Design a protein around this ligand. Sequence first.
Ligand SMILES: Cn1cc(C2=C(c3cn(CCCN)c4ccccc34)C(=O)NC2=O)c2ccccc21
Length: 285
Amino acid sequence: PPQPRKKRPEDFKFGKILGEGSFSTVVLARELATSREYAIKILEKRHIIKENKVPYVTRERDVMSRLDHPFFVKLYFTFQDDEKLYFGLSYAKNGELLKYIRKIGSFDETCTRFYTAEIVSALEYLHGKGIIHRDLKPENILLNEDMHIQITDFGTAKVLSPARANSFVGTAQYVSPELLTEKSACKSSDLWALGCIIYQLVAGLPPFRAGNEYLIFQKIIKLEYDFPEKFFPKARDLVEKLLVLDATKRLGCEEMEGYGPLKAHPFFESVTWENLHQQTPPKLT
Ligand SMILES: Cn1cc(C2=C(c3cn(CCCN)c4ccccc34)C(=O)NC2=O)c2ccccc21
């Protein structure tokens, strides 16, 4: 079927910079003909070529094209002028999840449950297509205008074909031990991350903290962390079935028999998994 015109820079009115990266910048832009707002990621071809990132830029584009779910930032289009690449991304009006965590300290039982259920839901979809995020964190979990989550940042993801290959290491506090002792990663890697996130929603801080990265990696492989007193019991329990050094024993992985058991965990008792994105999120305390 024929497609709409290939878009070009002039079709937009660029506005504020939302965020600046090492090899890119996200700029909020407004499309002239439609008046729609898109968050446009811009990258300089020369810089990318100079830094051997073609693999990372191509992957991000490819992975996102394949995605088609309400909990993932959509990639509306792409185009390029002589020196730059533009990626039309959906604009999450309420920003990073982390913002909220800092704004209110920790989440209460209901808000933790709800949002954790979306992450899980989103992870089940992703893994369903044999895709590993590899750097999941509150910074990558955005919130749309309705306060529903929207995972983004897939340039460092990985597509499976065998648990497989390797490359980089995501943010320190979310790295699973297998990456520190095996230089290899699988789906559970995202599960370990999930465990960390859940723990952070409840305690206000991630499981492994230390003066530097080398120190956090030291705690990770030794599994050094502990729960705070008021930590919701069922939540605590779920987290213990997630932060397991052995990646084949994490609740939710293939060897553990998938997402059935995970969604069936007591912590999600009252969750209705079927239409999460059509439910009204609990007001963030
Ligand atoms: C308000 N906000 C939304 C951002 C958005 C996105 C974004 C957000 N991140 C990660 C968090 C950046 N702080 C990205 C990483 C790679 C590519 C895009 C993003 C996005 O995909 N849509 C957005 O609306 C964003 C990015 C950087 C800084 C602030 C941001």
